[PDB]
């Protein structure tokens, strides 16, 4: 029942598709060679429209400016919640903040979930989320308690492929780097989507990929659910960066379904576990008519 | 890192676990011909058994009971614990254990194993972090087994377990 | 004794050290993934002046032009001898008739790179002592002295098995593209010809790799380095000629502006003298 603010200060960038080779060098450096960078928050998502990179300042200094690269004028912050499933956090945070007309970006991970808000909109967060969560701020690796200061529609499209969410042993990545580099760099040169998600946060790996790309890798070095469950995607589009994860999470907050929100420069995604998609085409569509 | 373990009932055996398992025997032989490894100026060791059937082990734990006498709980690097026996006795009273596979719902890295002093049938394991999982699982020894007894520690990582002896 | 003219046509390129990062994608493409690019002759050498790149025509289209790339105006072709002796048989007669020759050596064979405009000269002279064959469709068919510098480093010649490349690819990438920014020279040699691997690297960098997978001499012998300067782009003859007389085993590597020779560590104290005599 506690809110944590973390010390990361992130930067959100969109990279054009053909211009990937220009920024290849820092990309692979950040992915596979941690000793050469001070990065501690790195995440990458690939979409047919464009690429998205969330990286902190130390990693931001490594990207050479050019015209393929667009930078958003904000320094987002990271919030975490410790105690509380996806429905609980969605209902407890996303809706109240959206009532006060502020934008929120969601990134999920095989381990935890992260929430991104703007730096000049921190007072409103402390105001609205002080009645449930005990806000602590992490300064110098120690949570200093923040006393409550007296501060007074878009079309829906659903692809038809299946996705596998898994993690990795951080020692094993050397035995996989080559097979990974193809999928990231050399493969890309209506009822189907090409989707990939790679994120490295505080020494942990989370990957999202479709079942098609999955046979390429050896099976024993991938760590996924034993039963073998798959997922399915729902996505809604719009304008590039009152937020867009609201129009998915809110209507999905009137039930109990485990979502996997991933936000992009232009899209806003969500994953459901296969068995439950005859119902998320029900609540969504039936809310897309009134 | 490689580890050592003392046998809990026999005073002359111990195992070495670096990349495979190996049973030794403390042969007290000073006034003799040294066959065999040089432990000290009056003792030597002899390889009674060896096994290399598992890759990427993480932790081990001796069995505290009497009849099987060589049950070893090898905690692997994908979440699953496997019970391995390194003896030669053959059919004892419990010929059914010698190889189980306790799997958690999702696969992470194992960190710690344990054993109750008082009731030998309980085996606590500690696993890594997850978004919808329990981290402290208490099993019961009596792919195959998927329902543990007591599940604690939701959404956290456990790094050490120690049963209280009271 | 028979000579062979192979099917390969090669372009020799040099890239400036600051501007390497632009050419990483084509380089890794060529060097690590065989099923993606149709290439059969790749080799790369690290030198303080620049990097030296000699590839065939299919791989030439991958490299885009820039402000840190220079290309030789002519086209080379590869000659091989199959049947010490090499210098006394091909180079000295070739140099006697004013023909520029580039030499690349591998853990398996030697390669001699003559110009393509000079085919008649290169084989009218050399045909008296050699049987000349040309490979078509995969089937053979009948037809100003500079000073000598001696770096103090050590070196090792090597080979690997192709199945194990990705198990070391990360270390290779580190060394080439990340671990970079009168002695202590930086020298690295990598070549991929007809599906074969040759590596030359100093003993200091050898410790990083797992020393049970790299295949080398089963004694521990290491080589030593002799260098000669040069402005253009015949400079290799100035080492080979004066060194074939003593009948010593060598290992020649030529670059854009410099020529290299490798001699075993046991008898380094004579190759220096042999060129001090002149």
UniProtKB/Swiss-Prot annotation, chain B:
Transmembrane segments: none annotated. It is found in: Lysosome membrane. It comes from the Eukaryota. WD repeats lie at residues 52-94, 105-142. Component of the GATOR2 subcomplex, composed of MIOS, SEC13, SEH1L, WDR24 and WDR59. The GATOR2 complex interacts with CASTOR1 and CASTOR2; the interaction is negatively regulated by arginine. CASTOR1 and CASTOR2 convey leucine availability via direct interaction with MIOS. The GATOR2 complex interacts with SESN1, SESN2 and SESN3; the interaction is negatively regulated by amino acids. Belongs to the WD repeat mio family. As a component of the GATOR2 complex, functions as an activator of the amino acid-sensing branch of the mTORC1 signaling pathway. The GATOR2 complex indirectly activates mTORC1 through the inhibition of the GATOR1 subcomplex. GATOR2 probably acts as an E3 ubiquitin-protein ligase toward GATOR1. In the presence of abundant amino acids, the GATOR2 complex mediates ubiquitination of the NPRL2 core component of the GATOR1 complex, leading to GATOR1 inactivation. In the absence of amino acids, GATOR2 is inhibited, activating the GATOR1 complex. This is GATOR2 complex protein MIOS. The gene is MIOS. The chain holds residues 5 to 195 of 875 of the full protein.
From Swiss-Prot, chain C:
Changing residue 102 to F: No effect on interaction with the GATOR2 complex. Changing residue 257 to K: No effect on interaction with the GATOR2 complex. Widely expressed. The modification Phosphoserine is found at residue 14. Gene3D superfamilies: VC0802-like. Its main location: cytoplasm. Changing residue 235 to A: Loss of arginine-binding. Constitutively inhibits the TORC1 signaling pathway. Phosphorylation at Ser-14 by AKT1, promoting the interaction between CASTOR1 and RNF167. Changing residue 61 to R: In 3KR mutant; abolished ubiquitination by RNF167. Residues 72-127, 220-276 form the ACT domain. L-arginine binds at residues 100-101, 235-236, 255-259. It is found in: Cytoplasm, Cytosol. Keywords: Cytoplasm, Phosphoprotein, Ubl conjugation. Belongs to the GATS family. Based on x-ray crystallography data, the protein would be constituted of 4 tandem ACT domains instead of the 2 predicted from the sequence. Functions as an intracellular arginine sensor within the amino acid-sensing branch of the TORC1 signaling pathway. As a homodimer or a heterodimer with CASTOR2, binds and inhibits the GATOR subcomplex GATOR2 and thereby mTORC1. Binding of arginine to CASTOR1 allosterically disrupts the interaction of CASTOR1-containing dimers with GATOR2 which can in turn activate mTORC1 and the TORC1 signaling pathway. PANTHER family: CHROMOSOME 1, WHOLE GENOME SHOTGUN SEQUENCE (PTHR31131), CYTOSOLIC ARGININE SENSOR FOR MTORC1 SUBUNIT 1 (PTHR31131:SF3). This is Cytosolic arginine sensor for mTORC1 subunit 1. The gene is CASTOR1.
């Amino acid at each position: 029942m506690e809110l944590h603010i973390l010390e990361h200060r992130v930067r959100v960038l969109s990279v054009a598709r053909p211009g990937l080779w220009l920024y290849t060098h820092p990309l692979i450096k950040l992915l596979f060679l941690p000793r050469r960078s001070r990065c501690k928050f790195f995440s990458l998502t690939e979409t047919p429209e464009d690429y998205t990179l969330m990286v902190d300042e130390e990693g931001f200094k490594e990207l050479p400016p050019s015209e393929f690269l667009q930078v958003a004028e904000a320094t987002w912050l990271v919030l975490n919640v410790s105690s509380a499933g996806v429905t609980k956090i969605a209902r407890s945070v996303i809706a109240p903040l959206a009532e006060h007309h502020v934008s929120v970006l969601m990134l999920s991970t095989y381990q935890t979930d992260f929430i991104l808000v703007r730096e000049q909109d921190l007072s409103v967060v402390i105001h609205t989320l002080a009645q449930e969560f005990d806000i602590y701020r992490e300064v110098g690796g120690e949570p200093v308690p923040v006393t409550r200061d007296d501060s007074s529609v878009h079309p829906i499209q659903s692809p038809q492929n299946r996705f596998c969410v898994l993690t990795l042993d951080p020692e094993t990545l050397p035995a996989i780097a080559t097979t990974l580099i193809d999928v990231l760099f050399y493969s890309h040169s209506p009822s189907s989507i090409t989707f990939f998600a790679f994120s490295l946060i505080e020494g942990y790996i989370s990957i999202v990929m479709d079942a098609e790309t999955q046979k390429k890798f050896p099976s024993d070095l991938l760590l996924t659910s034993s039963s073998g469950e798959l997922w399915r995607m729902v996505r809604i589009g719009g304008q590039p960066l009152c937020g867009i994860v609201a129009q998915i999470a809110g209507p999905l907050a009137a039930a109990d379904i485990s979502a996997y929100y991933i936000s992009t420069f232009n899209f806003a995604h969500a994953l459901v576990p296969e068995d439950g998609i005859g119902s998320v085409i029900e609540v969504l569509q039936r809310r897309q008519e009134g | 890192k490689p580890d050592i373990l003392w046998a809990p009932h026999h005073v002359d055996r111990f195992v070495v676990c670096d990349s495979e398992l190996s049973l030794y025997h403390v042969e007290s032989t000073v006034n003799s011909e040294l066959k065999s490894l040089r432990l000290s100026e009056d003792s030597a060791a002899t390889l009674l058994s060896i096994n290399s059937d598992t890759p990427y082990m993480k932790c081990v734990a001796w069995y505290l009971n009497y009849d099987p006498e060589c049950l070893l709980a090898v905690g692997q690097a994908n979440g699953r614990v496997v019970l391995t026996s390194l003896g030669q006795d053959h059919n004892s009273k419990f010929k059914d254990l010698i190889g189980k596979e306790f799997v958690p719902k999702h696969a992470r890295q194992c960190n710690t194993l344990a054993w109750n002093p008082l009731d030998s049938n309980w085996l606590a394991a500690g696993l890594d972090k997850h978004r919808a999982d329990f981290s402290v699982l208490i099993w019961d020894i009596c792919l195959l087994v998927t329902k543990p007894l007591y599940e604690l520690g939701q959404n956290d990582a456990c790094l050490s377990l120690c049963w209280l002896p009271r």
